[PDB]
Tab-separated table of C-alpha atoms and ligand atoms in Angstrom:
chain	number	residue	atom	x	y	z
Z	1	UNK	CA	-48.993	7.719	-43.691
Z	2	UNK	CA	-50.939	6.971	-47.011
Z	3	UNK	CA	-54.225	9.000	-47.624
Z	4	UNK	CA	-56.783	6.854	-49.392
Z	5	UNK	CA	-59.648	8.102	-52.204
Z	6	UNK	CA	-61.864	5.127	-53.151
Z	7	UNK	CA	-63.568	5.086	-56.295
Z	8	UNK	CA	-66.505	3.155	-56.696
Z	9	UNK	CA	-66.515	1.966	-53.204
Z	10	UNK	CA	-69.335	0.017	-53.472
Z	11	UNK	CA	-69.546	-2.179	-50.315
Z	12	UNK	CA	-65.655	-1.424	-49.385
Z	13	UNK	CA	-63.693	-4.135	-51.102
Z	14	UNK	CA	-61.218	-2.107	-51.897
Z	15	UNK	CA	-61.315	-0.736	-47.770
Z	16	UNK	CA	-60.909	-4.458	-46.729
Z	17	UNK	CA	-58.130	-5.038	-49.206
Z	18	UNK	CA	-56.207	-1.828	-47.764
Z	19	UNK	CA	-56.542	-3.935	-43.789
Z	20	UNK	CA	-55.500	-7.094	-45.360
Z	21	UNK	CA	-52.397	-5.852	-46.668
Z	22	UNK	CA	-50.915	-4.502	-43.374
Z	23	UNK	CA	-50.057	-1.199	-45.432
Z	24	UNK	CA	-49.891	2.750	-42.886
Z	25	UNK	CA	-52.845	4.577	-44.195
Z	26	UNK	CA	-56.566	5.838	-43.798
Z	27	UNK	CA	-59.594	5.721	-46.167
Z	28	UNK	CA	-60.170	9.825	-46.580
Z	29	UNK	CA	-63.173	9.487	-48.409
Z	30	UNK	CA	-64.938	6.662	-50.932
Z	31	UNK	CA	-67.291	7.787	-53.449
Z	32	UNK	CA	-70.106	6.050	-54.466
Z	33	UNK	CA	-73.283	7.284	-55.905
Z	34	UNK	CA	-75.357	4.111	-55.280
Z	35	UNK	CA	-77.659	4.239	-51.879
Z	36	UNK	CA	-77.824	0.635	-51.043
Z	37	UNK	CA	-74.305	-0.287	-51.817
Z	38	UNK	CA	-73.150	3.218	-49.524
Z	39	UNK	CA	-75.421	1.437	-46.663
Z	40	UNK	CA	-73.800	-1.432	-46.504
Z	41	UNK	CA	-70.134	0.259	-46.596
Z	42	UNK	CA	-71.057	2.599	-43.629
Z	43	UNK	CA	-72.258	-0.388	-41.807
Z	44	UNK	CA	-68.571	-1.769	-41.829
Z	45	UNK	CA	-67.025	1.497	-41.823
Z	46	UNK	CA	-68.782	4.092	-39.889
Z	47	UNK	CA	-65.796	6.063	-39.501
Z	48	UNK	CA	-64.811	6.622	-42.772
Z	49	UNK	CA	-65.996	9.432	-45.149
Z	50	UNK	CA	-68.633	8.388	-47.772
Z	51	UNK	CA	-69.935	10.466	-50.203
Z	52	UNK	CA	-72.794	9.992	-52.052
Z	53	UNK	CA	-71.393	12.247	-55.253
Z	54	UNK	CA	-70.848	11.690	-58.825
Z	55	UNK	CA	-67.085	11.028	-59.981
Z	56	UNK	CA	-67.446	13.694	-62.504
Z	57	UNK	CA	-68.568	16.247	-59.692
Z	58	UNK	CA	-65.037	15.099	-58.079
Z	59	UNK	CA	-62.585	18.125	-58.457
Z	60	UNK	CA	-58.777	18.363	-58.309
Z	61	UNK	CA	-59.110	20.887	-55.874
Z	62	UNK	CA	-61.368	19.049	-53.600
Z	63	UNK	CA	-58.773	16.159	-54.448
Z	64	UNK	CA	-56.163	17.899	-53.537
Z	65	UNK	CA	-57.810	19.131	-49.620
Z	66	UNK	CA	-58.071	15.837	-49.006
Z	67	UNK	CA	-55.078	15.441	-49.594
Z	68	UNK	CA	-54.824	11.668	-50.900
Z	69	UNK	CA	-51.614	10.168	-51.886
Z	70	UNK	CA	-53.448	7.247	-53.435
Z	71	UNK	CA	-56.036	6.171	-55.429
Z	72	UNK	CA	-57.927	2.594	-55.332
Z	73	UNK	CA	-60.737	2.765	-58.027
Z	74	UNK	CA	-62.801	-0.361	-59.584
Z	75	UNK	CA	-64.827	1.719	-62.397
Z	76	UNK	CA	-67.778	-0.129	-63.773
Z	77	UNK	CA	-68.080	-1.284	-68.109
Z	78	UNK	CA	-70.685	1.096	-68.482
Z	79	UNK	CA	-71.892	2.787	-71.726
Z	80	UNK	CA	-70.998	5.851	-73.735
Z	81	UNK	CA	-73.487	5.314	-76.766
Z	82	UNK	CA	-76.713	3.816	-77.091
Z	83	UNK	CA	-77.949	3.340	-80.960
Z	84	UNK	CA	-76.001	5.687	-82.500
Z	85	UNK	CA	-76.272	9.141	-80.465
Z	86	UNK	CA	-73.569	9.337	-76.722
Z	87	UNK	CA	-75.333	9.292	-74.218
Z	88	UNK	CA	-75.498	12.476	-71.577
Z	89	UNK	CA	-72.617	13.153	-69.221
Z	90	UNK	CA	-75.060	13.827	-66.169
Z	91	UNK	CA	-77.314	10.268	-66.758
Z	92	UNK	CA	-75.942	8.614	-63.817
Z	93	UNK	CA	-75.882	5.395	-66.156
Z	94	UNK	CA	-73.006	6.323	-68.466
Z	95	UNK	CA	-69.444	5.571	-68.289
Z	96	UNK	CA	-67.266	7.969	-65.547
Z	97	UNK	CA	-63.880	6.785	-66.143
Z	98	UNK	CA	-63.097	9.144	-69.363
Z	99	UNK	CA	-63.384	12.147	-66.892
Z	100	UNK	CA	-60.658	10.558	-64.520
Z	101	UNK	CA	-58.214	9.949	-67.325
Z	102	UNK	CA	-58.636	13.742	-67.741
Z	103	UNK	CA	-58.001	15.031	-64.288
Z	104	UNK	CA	-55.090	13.411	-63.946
Z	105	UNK	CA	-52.560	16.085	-64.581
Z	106	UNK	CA	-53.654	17.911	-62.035
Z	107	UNK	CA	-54.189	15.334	-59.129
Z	108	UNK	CA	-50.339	16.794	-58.323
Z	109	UNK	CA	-50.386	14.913	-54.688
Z	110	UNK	CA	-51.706	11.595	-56.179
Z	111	UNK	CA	-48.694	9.076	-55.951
Z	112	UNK	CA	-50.421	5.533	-56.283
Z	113	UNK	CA	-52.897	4.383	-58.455
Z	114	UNK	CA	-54.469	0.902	-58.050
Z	115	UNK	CA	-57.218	0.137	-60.578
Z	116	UNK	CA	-59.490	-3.370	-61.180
Z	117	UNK	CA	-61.165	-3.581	-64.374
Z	118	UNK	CA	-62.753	-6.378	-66.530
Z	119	UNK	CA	-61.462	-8.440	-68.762
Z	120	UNK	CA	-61.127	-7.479	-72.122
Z	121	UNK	CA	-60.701	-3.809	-70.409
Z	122	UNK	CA	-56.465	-4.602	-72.221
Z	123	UNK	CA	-57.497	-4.534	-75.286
Z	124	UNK	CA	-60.332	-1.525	-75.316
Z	125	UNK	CA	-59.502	2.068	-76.696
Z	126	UNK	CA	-60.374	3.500	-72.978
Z	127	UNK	CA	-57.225	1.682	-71.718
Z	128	UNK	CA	-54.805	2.604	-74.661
Z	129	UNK	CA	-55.471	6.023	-73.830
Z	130	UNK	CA	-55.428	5.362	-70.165
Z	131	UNK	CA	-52.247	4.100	-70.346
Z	132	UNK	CA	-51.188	7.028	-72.143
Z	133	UNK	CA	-52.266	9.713	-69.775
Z	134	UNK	CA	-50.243	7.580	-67.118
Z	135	UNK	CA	-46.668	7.728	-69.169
Z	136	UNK	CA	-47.805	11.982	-69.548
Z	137	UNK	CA	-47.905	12.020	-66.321
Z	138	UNK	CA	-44.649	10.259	-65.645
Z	139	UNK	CA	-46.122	7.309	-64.200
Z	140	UNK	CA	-44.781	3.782	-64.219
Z	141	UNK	CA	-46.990	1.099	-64.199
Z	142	UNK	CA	-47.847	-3.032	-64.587
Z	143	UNK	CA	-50.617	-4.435	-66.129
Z	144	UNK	CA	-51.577	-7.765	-64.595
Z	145	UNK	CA	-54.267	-10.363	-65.084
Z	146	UNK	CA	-55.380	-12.139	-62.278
Z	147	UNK	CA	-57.516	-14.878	-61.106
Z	148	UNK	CA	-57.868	-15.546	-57.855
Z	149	UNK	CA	-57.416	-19.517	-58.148
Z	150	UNK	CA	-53.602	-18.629	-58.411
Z	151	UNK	CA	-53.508	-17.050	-54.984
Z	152	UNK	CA	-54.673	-19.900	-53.541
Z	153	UNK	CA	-58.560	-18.960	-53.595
Z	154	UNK	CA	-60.439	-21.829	-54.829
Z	155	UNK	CA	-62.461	-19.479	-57.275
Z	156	UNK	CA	-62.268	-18.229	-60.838
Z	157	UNK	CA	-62.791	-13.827	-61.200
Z	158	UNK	CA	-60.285	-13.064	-64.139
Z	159	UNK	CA	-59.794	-9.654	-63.604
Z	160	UNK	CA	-57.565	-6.789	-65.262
Z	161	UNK	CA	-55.602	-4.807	-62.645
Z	162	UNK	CA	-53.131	-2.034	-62.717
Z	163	UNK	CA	-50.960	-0.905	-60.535
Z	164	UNK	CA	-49.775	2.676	-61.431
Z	165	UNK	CA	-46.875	4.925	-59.404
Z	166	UNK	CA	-44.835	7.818	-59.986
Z	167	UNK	CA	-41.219	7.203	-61.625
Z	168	UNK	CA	-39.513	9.370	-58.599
Z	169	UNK	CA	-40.209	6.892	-55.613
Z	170	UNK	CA	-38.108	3.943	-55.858
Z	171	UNK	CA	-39.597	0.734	-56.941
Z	172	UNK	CA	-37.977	-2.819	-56.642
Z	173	UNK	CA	-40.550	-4.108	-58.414
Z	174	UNK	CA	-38.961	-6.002	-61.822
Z	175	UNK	CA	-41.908	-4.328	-63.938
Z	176	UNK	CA	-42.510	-5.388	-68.106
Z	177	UNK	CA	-44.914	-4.208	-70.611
Z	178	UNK	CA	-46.103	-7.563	-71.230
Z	179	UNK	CA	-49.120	-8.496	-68.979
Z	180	UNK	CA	-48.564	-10.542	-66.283
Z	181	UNK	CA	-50.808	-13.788	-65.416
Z	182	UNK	CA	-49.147	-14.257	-62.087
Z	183	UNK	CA	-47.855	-12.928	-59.102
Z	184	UNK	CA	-44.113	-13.345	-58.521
Z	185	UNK	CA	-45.297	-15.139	-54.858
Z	186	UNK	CA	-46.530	-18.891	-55.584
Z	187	UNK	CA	-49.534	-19.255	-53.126
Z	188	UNK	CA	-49.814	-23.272	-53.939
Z	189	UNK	CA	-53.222	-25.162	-54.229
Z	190	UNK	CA	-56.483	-23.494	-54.032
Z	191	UNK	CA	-57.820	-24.804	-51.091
Z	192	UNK	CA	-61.075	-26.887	-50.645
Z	193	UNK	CA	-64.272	-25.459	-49.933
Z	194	UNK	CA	-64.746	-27.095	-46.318
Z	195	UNK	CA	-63.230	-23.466	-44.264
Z	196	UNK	CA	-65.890	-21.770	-45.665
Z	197	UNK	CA	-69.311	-24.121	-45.425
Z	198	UNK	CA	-71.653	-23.919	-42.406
Z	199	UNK	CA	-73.982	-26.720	-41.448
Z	200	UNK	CA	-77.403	-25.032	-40.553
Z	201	UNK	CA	-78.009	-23.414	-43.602
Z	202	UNK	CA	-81.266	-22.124	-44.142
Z	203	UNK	CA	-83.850	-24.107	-46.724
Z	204	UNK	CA	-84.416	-20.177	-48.313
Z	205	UNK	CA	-81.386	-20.932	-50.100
Z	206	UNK	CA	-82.381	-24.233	-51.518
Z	207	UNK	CA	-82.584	-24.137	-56.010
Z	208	UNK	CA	-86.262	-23.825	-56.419
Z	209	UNK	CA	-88.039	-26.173	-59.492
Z	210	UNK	CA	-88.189	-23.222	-61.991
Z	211	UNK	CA	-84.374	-23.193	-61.641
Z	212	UNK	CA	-84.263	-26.852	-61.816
Z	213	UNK	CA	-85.727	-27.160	-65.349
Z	214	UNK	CA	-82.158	-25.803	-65.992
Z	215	UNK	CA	-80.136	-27.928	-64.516
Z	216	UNK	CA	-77.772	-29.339	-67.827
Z	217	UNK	CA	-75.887	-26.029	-67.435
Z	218	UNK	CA	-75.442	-25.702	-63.153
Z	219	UNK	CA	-72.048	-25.976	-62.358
Z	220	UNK	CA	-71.851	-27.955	-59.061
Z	221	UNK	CA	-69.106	-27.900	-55.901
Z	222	UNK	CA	-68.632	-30.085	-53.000
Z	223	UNK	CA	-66.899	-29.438	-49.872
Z	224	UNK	CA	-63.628	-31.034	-51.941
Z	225	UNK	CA	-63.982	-28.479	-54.975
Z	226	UNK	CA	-61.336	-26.613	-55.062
Z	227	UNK	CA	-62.273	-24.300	-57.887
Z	228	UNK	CA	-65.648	-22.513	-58.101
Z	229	UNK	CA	-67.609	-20.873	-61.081
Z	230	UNK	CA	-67.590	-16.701	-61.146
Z	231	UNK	CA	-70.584	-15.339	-59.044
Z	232	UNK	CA	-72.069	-12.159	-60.934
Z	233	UNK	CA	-75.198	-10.005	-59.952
Z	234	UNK	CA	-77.102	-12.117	-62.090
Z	235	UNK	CA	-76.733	-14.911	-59.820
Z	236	UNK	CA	-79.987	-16.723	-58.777
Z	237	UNK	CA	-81.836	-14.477	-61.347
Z	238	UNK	CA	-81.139	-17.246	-63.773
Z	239	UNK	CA	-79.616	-20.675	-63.273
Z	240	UNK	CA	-76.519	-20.478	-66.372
Z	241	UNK	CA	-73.019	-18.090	-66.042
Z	242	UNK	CA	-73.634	-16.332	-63.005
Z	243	UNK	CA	-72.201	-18.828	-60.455
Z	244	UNK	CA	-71.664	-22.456	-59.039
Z	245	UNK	CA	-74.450	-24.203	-57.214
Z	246	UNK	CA	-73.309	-26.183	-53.979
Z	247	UNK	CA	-74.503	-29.544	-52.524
Z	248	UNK	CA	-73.808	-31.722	-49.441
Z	249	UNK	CA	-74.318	-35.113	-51.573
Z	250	UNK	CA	-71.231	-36.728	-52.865
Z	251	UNK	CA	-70.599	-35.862	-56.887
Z	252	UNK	CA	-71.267	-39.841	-57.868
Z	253	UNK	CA	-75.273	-39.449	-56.425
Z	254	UNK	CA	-75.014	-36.120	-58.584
Z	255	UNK	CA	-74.102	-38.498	-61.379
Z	256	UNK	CA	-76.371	-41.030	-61.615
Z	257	UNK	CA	-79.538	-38.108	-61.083
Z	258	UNK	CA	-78.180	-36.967	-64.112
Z	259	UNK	CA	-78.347	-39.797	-66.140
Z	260	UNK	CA	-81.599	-40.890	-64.817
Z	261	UNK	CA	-82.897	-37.819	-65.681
Z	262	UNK	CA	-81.017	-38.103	-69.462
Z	263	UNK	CA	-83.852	-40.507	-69.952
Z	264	UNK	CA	-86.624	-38.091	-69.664
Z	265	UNK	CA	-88.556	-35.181	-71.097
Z	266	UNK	CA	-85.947	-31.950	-70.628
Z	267	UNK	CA	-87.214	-29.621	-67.960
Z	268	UNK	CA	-89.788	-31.989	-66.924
Z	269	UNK	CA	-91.865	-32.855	-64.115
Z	270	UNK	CA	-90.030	-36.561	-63.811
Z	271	UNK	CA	-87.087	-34.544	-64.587
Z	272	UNK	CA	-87.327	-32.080	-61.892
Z	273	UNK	CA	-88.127	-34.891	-58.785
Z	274	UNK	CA	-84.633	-36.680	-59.391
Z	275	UNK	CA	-83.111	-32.917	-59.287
Z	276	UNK	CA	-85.431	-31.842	-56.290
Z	277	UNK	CA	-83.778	-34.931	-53.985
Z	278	UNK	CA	-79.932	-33.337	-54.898
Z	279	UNK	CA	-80.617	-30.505	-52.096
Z	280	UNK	CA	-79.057	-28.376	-54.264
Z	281	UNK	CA	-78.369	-24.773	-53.171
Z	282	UNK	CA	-77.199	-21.592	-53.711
Z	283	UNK	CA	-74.016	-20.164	-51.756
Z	284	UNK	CA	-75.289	-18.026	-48.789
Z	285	UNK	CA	-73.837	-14.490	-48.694
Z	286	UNK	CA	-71.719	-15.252	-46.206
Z	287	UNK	CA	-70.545	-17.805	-47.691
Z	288	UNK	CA	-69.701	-15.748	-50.910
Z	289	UNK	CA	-68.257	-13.429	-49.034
Z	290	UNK	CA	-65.838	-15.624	-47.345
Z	291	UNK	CA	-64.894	-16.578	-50.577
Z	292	UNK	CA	-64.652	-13.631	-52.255
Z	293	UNK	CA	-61.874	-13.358	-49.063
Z	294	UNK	CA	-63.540	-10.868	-46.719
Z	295	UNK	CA	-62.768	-10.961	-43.573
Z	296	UNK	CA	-65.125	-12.352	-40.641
Z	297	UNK	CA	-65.673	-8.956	-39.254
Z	298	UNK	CA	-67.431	-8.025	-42.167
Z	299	UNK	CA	-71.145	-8.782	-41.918
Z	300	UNK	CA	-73.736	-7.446	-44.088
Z	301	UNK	CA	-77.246	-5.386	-42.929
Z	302	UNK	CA	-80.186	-7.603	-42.765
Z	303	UNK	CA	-82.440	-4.638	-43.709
Z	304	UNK	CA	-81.111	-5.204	-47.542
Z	305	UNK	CA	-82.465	-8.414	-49.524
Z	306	UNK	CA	-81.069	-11.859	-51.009
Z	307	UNK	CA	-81.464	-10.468	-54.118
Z	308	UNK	CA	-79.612	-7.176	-53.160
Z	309	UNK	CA	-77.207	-8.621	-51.553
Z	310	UNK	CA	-75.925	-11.088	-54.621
Z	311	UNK	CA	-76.073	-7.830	-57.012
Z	312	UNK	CA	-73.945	-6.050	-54.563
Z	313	UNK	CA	-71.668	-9.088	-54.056
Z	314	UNK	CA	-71.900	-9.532	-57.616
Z	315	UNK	CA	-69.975	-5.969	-58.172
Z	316	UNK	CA	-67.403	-6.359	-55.858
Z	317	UNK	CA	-63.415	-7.441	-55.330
Z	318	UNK	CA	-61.311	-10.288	-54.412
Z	319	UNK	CA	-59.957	-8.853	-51.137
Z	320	UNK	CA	-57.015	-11.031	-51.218
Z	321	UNK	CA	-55.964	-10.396	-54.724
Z	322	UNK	CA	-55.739	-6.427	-54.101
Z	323	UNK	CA	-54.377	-7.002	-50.966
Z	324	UNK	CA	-51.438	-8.515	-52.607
Z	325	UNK	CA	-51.200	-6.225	-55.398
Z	326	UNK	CA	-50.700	-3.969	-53.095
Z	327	UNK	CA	-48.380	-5.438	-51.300
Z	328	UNK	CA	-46.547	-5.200	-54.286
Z	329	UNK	CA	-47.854	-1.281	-55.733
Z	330	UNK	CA	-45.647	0.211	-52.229
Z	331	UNK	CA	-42.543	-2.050	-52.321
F	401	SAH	N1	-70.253	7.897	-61.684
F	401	SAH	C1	-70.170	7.220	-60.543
F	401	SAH	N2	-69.831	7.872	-59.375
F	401	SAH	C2	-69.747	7.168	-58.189
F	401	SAH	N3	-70.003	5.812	-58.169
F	401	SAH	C3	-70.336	5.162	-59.313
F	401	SAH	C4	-70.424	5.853	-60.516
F	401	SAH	N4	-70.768	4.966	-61.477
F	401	SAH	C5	-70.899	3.742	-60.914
F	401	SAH	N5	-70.633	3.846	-59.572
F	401	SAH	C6	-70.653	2.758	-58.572
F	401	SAH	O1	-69.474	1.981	-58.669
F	401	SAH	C7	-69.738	0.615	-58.409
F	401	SAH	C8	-68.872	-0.250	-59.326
F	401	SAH	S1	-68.853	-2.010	-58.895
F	401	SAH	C9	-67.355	-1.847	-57.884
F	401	SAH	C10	-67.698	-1.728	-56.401
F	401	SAH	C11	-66.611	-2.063	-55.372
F	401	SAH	N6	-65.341	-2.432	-55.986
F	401	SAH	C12	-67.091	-3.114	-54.366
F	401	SAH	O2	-66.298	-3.714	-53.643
F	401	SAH	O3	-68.288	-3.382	-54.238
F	401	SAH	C13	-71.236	0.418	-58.602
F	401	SAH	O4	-71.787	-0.194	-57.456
F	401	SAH	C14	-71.818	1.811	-58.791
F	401	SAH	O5	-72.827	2.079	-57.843
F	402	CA	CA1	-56.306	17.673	-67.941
């Protein structure tokens, strides 16, 4: 019934999200322009039209052929000016999303509009307008923002969101200008980390000593965490921000290694040996995605990298999150 465009597929988040939520419609193209992240989507979606095409090369009038209904788009924070002088509309590293806001009085057909954004995207100039182009366009709209350890995910990815539909299809939803920090549906306790943990995991995945040396700042989970630290694309590029590190050892060994090594040189070798016998290690792909709510089905090439893979992971959605924004987006 619905026809899907998905901007900035990357590895189909936003494709999952659209299964998950039990919702009648078809993916009718995603556009991405990145070849690696496009490889792993058609690996999970062969079916579905890809295109490897610039969202500023996206037309209403292709748009409008295709005809999509609705719109699921997760545009990157990307710059427009680099020391004083914009940067060029066709460098495939500048921000697309100002060309979107454009187009949209003429995407006639378009009905639903579900975007994911970072946070901090509420109080930029690009969402002002945004917002602004929507109430042109006779839109109605909430703003939410949403972590996924309030739908029950035991894992912190504050995220802005907005869900944005046309003011002549009737909507139950109670919607408010004021942002919203929580879905209406209480999903309990984040549960622990046990569902998703698998018991021959590879040594690959191990901390190395390098890593080690930085080992004050880790944030560590257990099988009974039931919150996590926010994996990025930076993570096992550097040991501090860019995700938790797991171990099978309960969190009162973890303890006393740390205060054993409180009485030595910082970084050191003597330091490092009490933090080598933690078997500390990273999350496996899998593992993130499982936690990142994918479903089993998904699976990812193993043609690409480790170090691919956690950029591309990095850059992508909580399934479950969207799935229940939508939920809520066609009530
Ligand atoms: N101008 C543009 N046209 C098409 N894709 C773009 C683009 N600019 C950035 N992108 C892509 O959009 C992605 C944003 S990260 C979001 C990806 C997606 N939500 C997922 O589940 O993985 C990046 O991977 C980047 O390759
Ligand atoms: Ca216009």
């Amino acid at each position: 019934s619905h026809k899907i465009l998905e901007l900035y597929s990357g590895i189909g988040g936003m494709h999952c999200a659209w299964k998950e939520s039990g919702l009648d419609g078809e993916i009718v193209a995603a556009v991405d322009i990145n070849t690696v992240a496009n490889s792993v989507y058609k690996h999970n979606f062969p079916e579905t039209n890809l295109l490897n095409r610039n969202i500023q090369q996206l037309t209403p009038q292709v748009i409008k052929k295709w005809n999509v209904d609705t719109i699921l788009m997760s545009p990157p924070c990307q710059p427009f000016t680099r020391n004083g002088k914009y940067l060029d509309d066709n460098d495939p590293r500048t921000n697309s999303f100002l060309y979107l806001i454009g187009i949209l009085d003429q995407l006639d057909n378009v009905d639903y509009i579900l975007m994911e954004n970072v946070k901090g995207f509420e109080n930029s100039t690009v969402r002002n307008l945004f917002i602004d182009k929507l109430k042109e366009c006779n839109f109605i709209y909430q703003e939410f923002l949403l972590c996924p350890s309030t739908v029950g995910v035991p894992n912190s990815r504050l995220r802005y969101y907005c869900t944005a539909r046309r003011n002549n299809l009737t909507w139950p939803f109670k919607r408010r200008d004021e942002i919203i920090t929580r879905l209406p549906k209480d999903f309990g306790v984040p549960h622990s980390l046990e569902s998703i943990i698998e018991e021959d995991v590879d040594e690959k995945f191990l901390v190395p000593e390098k890593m080690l040396r930085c080992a004050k700042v880790f944030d560590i989970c257990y099988k009974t965490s039931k919150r996590s630290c926010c994996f990025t694309k930076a993570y096992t590029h550097y040991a501090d921000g860019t995700g938790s590190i797991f171990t099978d050892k309960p969190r009162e060994v973890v303890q006393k290694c740390y205060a054993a090594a409180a009485q030595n040189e910082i970084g050191g070798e003597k330091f490092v040996e009490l933090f080598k016998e933690l078997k500390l290690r990273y999350f496996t792909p899998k593992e993130v995605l499982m936690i990142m709510c994918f479903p089993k089905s998904y699976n990812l090439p193993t043609n690409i990298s480790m170090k691919q893979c956690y950029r591309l992971l990095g850059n992508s959605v909580n399934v479950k999150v969207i799935s229940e924004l939508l939920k809520i987006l066609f009530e």
